[PDB]
Amino acid sequence: SIKQTRLQQLNKIQTLTRANLQAQEELRQKELDLLEAELQYQQQADGQ
């Protein structure tokens, strides 16, 4: 039962740690780039 237990949680927590990094990657990458991109793109008004 202890083995069942540790097996069971490694199987979730590891699955999810990994799944979550990937889900999070989408969520976090957009966090920095949407706004930086708007700053840099709107800045073209000066470049013009």
Q: What is the resolution of this structure in A?
A: 3.8
DSSP H stretches of helix in the chain:
2-42, 44-47
User: What are the structure tokens assigned to 41, written together?
Assistant: 């793109």
Instruction: Return the DSSP state at 43.
Output: T
Provide the experimental method for this PDB entry: cryo-EM
Residue burial 5-25, b: 16+ Cβ < 10 Å; e: rest:
eeeeeeeeeeeeeeeeeeeee
What sign results for the dihedral spanned by CA atoms 14, 16, 19, 22? negative
In whole angstroms, give the CA distance from residue 7 to residue 13.
10
